[PDB]
Amino acid sequence: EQMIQSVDRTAVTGASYFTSVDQSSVHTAEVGSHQIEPLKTSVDKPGSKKTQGEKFFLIHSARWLTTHALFHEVAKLDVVKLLYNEQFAVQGLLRYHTYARFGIEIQVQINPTPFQQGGLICAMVPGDQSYGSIASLTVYPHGLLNCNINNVVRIKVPFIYTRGAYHFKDPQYPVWELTIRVWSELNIGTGTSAYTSLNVLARFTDLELHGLTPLS
């Protein structure tokens, strides 16, 4: 007894999310193999989620001057919204994926000349500075600045939000709001320079992606 087998009609193939089931199917032929390159024309790792979406991104550049009074808010911005911009590589991962869940890494670098004096504050505020005390900001995870000792601090805070995932197209409220206020006034004499720079390097940590969208 001989039997000539025929082609199967039903087939469940495709990709992760794009799912197709066909009634008229055929055998997918395959020749060759995925060839590796021994004399590597690229000595670093390829593009991946781990190295692209988590890397320090400059979001704002201001300049702390001498004419600022006490407890003047130097910077007032959204850490999440400034990372949503066309000029970054995190635009490439967040454009097709709507939902977002992430931790916030903060590193702020300033550069004073040592013939000045004064100090700053860098707190991480959830939501808004609605009725929080200026003098009680150290309860927040903060990092201070000094013209005597250091010029680099870092702050690692988790996702503080009323929900779990994030919507980019219509946010209810900003998730984090990085604040920088004048902790001590910047004084100079004669000849000492009356400017010193300020930069905020921010990046995401522990990103999830859910629910792909067709729209931009």
**In the range 25-84, which residues lie near a copy of itself by CB under 8 A?**
25-35
Q: Does 122 engage in binding with a copy of itself (CB under 8 A)? A: no
Longest dimension (CA), the chain: 107
Q: Which of 108, 116, 128 lies closest to 57, judged by CA?
A: 108
* Sign of the alpha-carbon torsion through 130, 133, 134, 137: negative
Question: Contact region for a copy of itself (CB under 8 A) — 2-10, 48-56, 97-105, 200-208?
Answer: 2-10
Q: Which does 109 bind (CB under 5 to 8 A by kind): a copy of itself, other proteins, none?
A: a copy of itself
- DSSP 3-state assignment of 95? coil
Q: Interface mask (CB under 8 A) for other proteins, residues 145-184, using x and -?
A: xxxxxx--xx-x-xxxxxxxxxx-xx-x------------
CB 157 within 8 A of CB 202: no
DSSP 6-74: ---S-EEEE-SS-EEEESS-------S-----SS-S--SPPP-HHHHSSS-EEEEEEEEESS--TT-EE
199 counts as binding a copy of itself under rule CB under 8 A: no
- In the block, which residue shows the tokens 């199967």? 8
x/- track of binding to other proteins for residues 26-65 (CB under 8 A)? xxxxxxxxxxxxxxxxxxx---------------------
Contact flag: residue 21 with other proteins (CB under 8 A): yes
What is the rounded CA–CA span in Å between residue 211 and residue 216?
13
In the shown chain, the binding pattern of residues 58 to 97 toward other proteins, with x for contact by CB under 8 A and - for none, equals: --------------------------------------x-
CB of 45 to other proteins, least distance (A): 10
Footprint on this chain of a copy of itself (rule: CB under 8 A): 2, 4, 7-8, 10-11, 22, 24-35, 109, 141, 143, 149-159
